[PDB]
Amino acid sequence: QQFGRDIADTTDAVRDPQTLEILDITPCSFGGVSVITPGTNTSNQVAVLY
Amino acid sequence: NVLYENQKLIANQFNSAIGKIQDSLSSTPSALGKLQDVVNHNAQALNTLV
């Protein structure tokens, strides 16, 4: 076996040829950004939601 | 006037019906079709995109 996969047809586990130990793969931390603001007629400050 | 002359009977029948429906909601496995179908439809439509 060279490398694994999952249900969603994406790469999950990869074995390097240098060492018999296998390395898992998890993508970088991704997510939407959202802003929490009051009315601009009222105030100016904002709060960031990740 | 028919209620106050049969209060114990109505109470016993109500408790028996409550116990019966509590048993029947767990005995039959196909009594929860709609919620399982909508969550399975959502999961399948999300999986086919990937």
CSV table of C-alpha atoms in Angstrom, one decimal:
chain,number,residue,atom,x,y,z
A,1,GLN,CA,0.0,0.0,0.0
A,2,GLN,CA,1.3,3.4,-1.0
A,3,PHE,CA,-1.3,5.9,0.3
A,4,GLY,CA,-4.8,5.8,1.7
A,5,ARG,CA,-8.0,7.6,1.0
A,6,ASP,CA,-11.5,8.0,2.6
A,7,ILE,CA,-15.2,8.1,1.7
A,8,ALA,CA,-15.0,11.6,0.1
A,9,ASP,CA,-12.3,10.5,-2.5
A,10,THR,CA,-9.6,12.7,-0.9
A,11,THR,CA,-6.1,11.9,0.2
A,12,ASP,CA,-5.9,11.1,3.9
A,13,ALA,CA,-2.8,9.0,4.7
A,14,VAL,CA,0.5,9.1,2.9
A,15,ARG,CA,3.5,6.8,3.4
A,16,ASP,CA,6.9,8.4,2.6
A,17,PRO,CA,9.4,6.1,0.8
A,18,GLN,CA,12.3,7.0,3.2
A,19,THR,CA,10.7,5.7,6.3
A,20,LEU,CA,8.1,2.8,6.8
A,21,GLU,CA,6.2,5.0,9.3
A,22,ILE,CA,3.0,6.5,7.7
A,23,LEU,CA,2.0,10.2,7.9
A,24,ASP,CA,-1.5,11.4,8.2
A,25,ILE,CA,-2.8,14.3,6.1
A,26,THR,CA,-5.2,17.0,7.4
A,27,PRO,CA,-5.7,20.2,5.5
A,28,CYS,CA,-4.8,23.7,6.8
A,29,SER,CA,-7.2,25.4,9.2
A,30,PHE,CA,-9.9,26.9,6.9
A,31,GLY,CA,-13.1,28.7,7.7
A,32,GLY,CA,-15.3,31.7,6.9
A,33,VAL,CA,-14.9,35.1,8.6
A,34,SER,CA,-17.8,37.1,9.8
A,35,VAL,CA,-18.2,40.6,11.2
A,36,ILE,CA,-20.4,41.5,14.1
A,37,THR,CA,-21.2,45.2,14.0
A,38,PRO,CA,-23.8,47.6,15.4
A,39,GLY,CA,-25.3,50.4,13.3
A,40,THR,CA,-22.7,52.8,11.9
A,41,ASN,CA,-25.1,55.6,12.8
A,42,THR,CA,-24.7,54.3,16.4
A,43,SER,CA,-21.1,53.3,16.9
A,44,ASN,CA,-18.0,52.3,15.0
A,45,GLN,CA,-16.4,49.3,16.7
A,46,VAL,CA,-16.6,45.8,15.2
A,47,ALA,CA,-16.1,42.2,16.4
A,48,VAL,CA,-14.7,39.5,14.2
A,49,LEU,CA,-16.3,36.0,14.2
A,50,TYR,CA,-14.3,33.1,12.8
B,1,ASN,CA,-71.1,15.1,33.4
B,2,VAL,CA,-69.6,12.0,31.7
B,3,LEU,CA,-66.0,12.9,32.8
B,4,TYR,CA,-66.4,13.1,36.6
B,5,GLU,CA,-68.2,9.8,36.6
B,6,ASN,CA,-65.4,8.0,34.8
B,7,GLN,CA,-62.2,9.8,36.0
B,8,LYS,CA,-60.3,6.8,37.2
B,9,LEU,CA,-61.0,4.9,34.0
B,10,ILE,CA,-59.9,7.8,31.9
B,11,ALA,CA,-56.7,8.2,34.0
B,12,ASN,CA,-55.9,4.5,33.7
B,13,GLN,CA,-56.5,4.5,29.9
B,14,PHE,CA,-54.4,7.6,29.4
B,15,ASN,CA,-51.5,6.1,31.4
B,16,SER,CA,-51.8,2.8,29.4
B,17,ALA,CA,-51.8,4.8,26.1
B,18,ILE,CA,-48.7,6.7,27.2
B,19,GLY,CA,-46.9,3.5,28.1
B,20,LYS,CA,-48.0,1.9,24.8
B,21,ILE,CA,-46.8,4.8,22.7
B,22,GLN,CA,-43.5,4.9,24.6
B,23,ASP,CA,-43.0,1.2,23.8
B,24,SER,CA,-44.1,1.5,20.2
B,25,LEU,CA,-41.8,4.4,19.4
B,26,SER,CA,-38.9,2.2,20.2
B,27,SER,CA,-40.1,-1.2,19.0
B,28,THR,CA,-40.8,-0.1,15.4
B,29,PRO,CA,-37.6,1.0,13.6
B,30,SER,CA,-39.3,2.6,10.6
B,31,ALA,CA,-41.4,5.1,12.6
B,32,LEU,CA,-38.8,7.9,12.2
B,33,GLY,CA,-38.8,8.0,8.4
B,34,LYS,CA,-39.0,11.8,7.7
B,35,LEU,CA,-36.1,13.1,9.9
B,36,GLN,CA,-33.8,10.3,8.8
B,37,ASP,CA,-34.7,10.8,5.2
B,38,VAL,CA,-34.1,14.6,5.3
B,39,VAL,CA,-30.7,14.2,7.1
B,40,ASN,CA,-29.7,11.4,4.7
B,41,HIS,CA,-30.7,13.6,1.7
B,42,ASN,CA,-28.6,16.4,3.0
B,43,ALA,CA,-25.6,14.1,3.6
B,44,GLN,CA,-25.9,12.5,0.1
B,45,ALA,CA,-26.2,15.9,-1.6
B,46,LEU,CA,-23.2,17.1,0.4
B,47,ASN,CA,-21.2,13.9,-0.5
B,48,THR,CA,-21.9,14.0,-4.2
B,49,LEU,CA,-20.4,17.5,-4.4
B,50,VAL,CA,-17.1,16.3,-3.0
